[PDB]
Homo-oligomer: A and B are copies of this chain.
Amino acid sequence: RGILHTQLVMSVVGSVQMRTNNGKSNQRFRLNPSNPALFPTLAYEAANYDMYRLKKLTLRYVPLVTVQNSGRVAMIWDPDSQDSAPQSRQEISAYSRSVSTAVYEKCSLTIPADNQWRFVADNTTVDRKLVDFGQLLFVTHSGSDGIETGDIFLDCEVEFKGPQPTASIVQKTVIDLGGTLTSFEGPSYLMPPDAFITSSSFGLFVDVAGTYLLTLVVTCSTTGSVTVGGNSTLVGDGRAAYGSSNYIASIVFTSSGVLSTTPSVQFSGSSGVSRVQMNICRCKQGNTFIL
């Protein structure tokens, strides 16, 4: 028999109007084990292999808030991985596997598994449709806007066929003025609508809920302070440096996955930001820098 793995997926933040996978597109919750959002602990095993096959899948929304904040969390599975995110509130019952209850009460949803071996995404494939097992979509619509409602767990029995040299679990992203985040050599901790640069400032929203390690490489002309807040606190040893036209810093912070209308990591005060290069690693608290 296999081994179950309970894994944290989201911290569900409620909404008033209508909202999909909360701040993000219909790209986040792909059913591949090469996805840090749905698989925070199996992505390290998924870097060693190229074929997977799912056996048991349950979603387990567990509430956290007091029973005073009305809401409706829905959990939806697609067989596609390229269908668009749902548009209305009432385009929810038209899916195949769906559980939609109130915010304050726990749920469950079982997903029937196939028997086909599928590729583990270390790419840059064009068709995600034939690779993934499907999407997971999470919808909130009543109210109780800025409140951590609950959190969604996920249980798996994943087996892997033929191995591989390890896919490098360190991102590498580049921003230009007017550009977006563009990943390089994987994985997908950051999605492209997660950052912004100006002529003087810089910011990153991080919602995967881990403890990470940055290496800022920012091309500016003056120095700038680096503040960490909103979703994440410093494991406070953030040592930066200046020199030539580069700006180099290294940060250890612990995000919490919750949305906020403040960037998690923010760089301000400088002038003429042109490029920002990143590396994120998912480290632990012992990887700080002694003053």
Contact = CB atoms under 8 A, between A and B. Distances in A.
A143 B146 CA distance: 10
Contact of A93 (B5, B70, B144, B258): B5
A137 to B, nearest CB: 11
A95 interface: yes
Contacts of A103: 64
Interface in A36-84: 37, 40-42, 44, 62-72, 78-80, 82-84
Interface string A84-101: 111111111111111011
A85 B7 contact: no
Contacts of A144: 148
Chain B CB count within 10 A is highest, among A5, A68, A87, for: A87
A88 B40 contact: yes
B41 A87 contact: no
A62 B283 contact: no
A41 B129 contact: no
A184 B287 contact: yes
Contacts of A233: 17
A25 to B, nearest CB: 8
A2 to B, nearest CB: 15
A153 B257 contact: no
Given A5-B93, A89-B257, A166-B41, A84 B125 contact: no
A177 interface: no
Closest 7 CB pairs of A and B: A142-B148, A41-B94, A143-B148, A64-B70, A7-B93, A84-B284, A88-B209
